[PDB]
Amino acid sequence: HAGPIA
Amino acid sequence: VNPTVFFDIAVDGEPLGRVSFELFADKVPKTAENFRALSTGEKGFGYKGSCFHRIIPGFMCQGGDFTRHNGTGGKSIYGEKFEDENFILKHTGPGILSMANAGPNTNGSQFFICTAKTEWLDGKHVVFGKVKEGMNIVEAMERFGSRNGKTSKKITIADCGQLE
């Protein structure tokens, strides 16, 4: 799964 | 020297507003070119018609998944997944366009538009562009999101191509 956090 | 591409954004079919991007050719030519070719469909595929599946208010808006449309798809033009060109440009504030990866050396087609300063992503995500006009149209797509990523209405890239 792709996608940056915070 | 800097290619300029754009996204005509739509909320539930209805066109919301336009959002243009600078593809930082000089600092990030491998990564920005990818977005450029993906924006045109001169590669055979790309972002046209795709949606912003993950929008977190005050954080960012993520899209680019034109294969599975959720975070598990998308495929770059250098094949399927290219290595992070560099981390020279930081996530300095709202408007920053950066690549949405799945663990280092995994840039495909997914990207995200920052709606705040995200310095923590510096070094982890390849910055390759920024909202030129319509950063208020990206602040428009902001409201239709939530803490978890999930959007209210369907944010889509109606059309897309290069202008300069």
Side-chain angles (χ1 to χ4, degrees):
Chain A
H1 211 265
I5 37 62
Chain B
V1 311
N2 280 138
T4 299
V5 298
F6 71 92
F7 285 172
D8 279 305
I9 301 308
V11 179
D12 282 6
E14 175 264 334
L16 185 59
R18 180 175 300 191
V19 58
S20 56
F21 316 93
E22 178 181 346
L23 306 190
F24 293 122
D26 51 8
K27 322 162 202 174
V28 206
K30 159 137 178 176
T31 306
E33 224 319 272
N34 180 77
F35 201 84
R36 203 282 302 131
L38 279 168
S39 278
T40 69
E42 69 140 12
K43 256 45 243 70
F45 47 106
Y47 311 112
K48 175 175 167 50
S50 66
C51 68
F52 278 80
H53 61 272
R54 195 179 168 242
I55 300 182
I56 301 178
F59 181 24
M60 60 72 243
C61 303
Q62 188 181 343
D65 194 349
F66 56 68
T67 67
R68 283 184 186 60
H69 313 65
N70 61 10
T72 317
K75 65 156 67 278
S76 68
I77 53 163
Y78 306 133
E80 3 64 277
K81 49 201 162 283
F82 68 98
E83 83 294 337
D84 298 18
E85 172 147 41
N86 62 149
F87 304 103
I88 290 181
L89 315 190
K90 289 183 154 299
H91 299 73
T92 56
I96 290 299
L97 178 61
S98 187
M99 282 314 270
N101 54 65
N105 285 270
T106 60
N107 297 308
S109 67
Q110 288 179 57
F111 63 83
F112 63 96
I113 301 174
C114 297
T115 62
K117 188 201 177 199
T118 68
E119 65 286 334
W120 56 98
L121 301 178
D122 297 355
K124 293 239 302 178
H125 296 266
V126 198
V127 171
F128 67 144
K130 76 98 183 54
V131 183
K132 312 245 213 186
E133 321 289 335
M135 191 55 221
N136 87 315
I137 301 299
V138 172
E139 249 65 51
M141 306 161 208
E142 262 277 290
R143 293 157 315 188
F144 313 129
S146 55
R147 297 291 77 112
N148 54 105
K150 178 181 181 170
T151 46
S152 156
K153 318 195 109 181
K154 261 297 303 299
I155 320 303
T156 300
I157 298 165
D159 217 333
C160 53
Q162 183 167 30
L163 286 175
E164 196 203 350

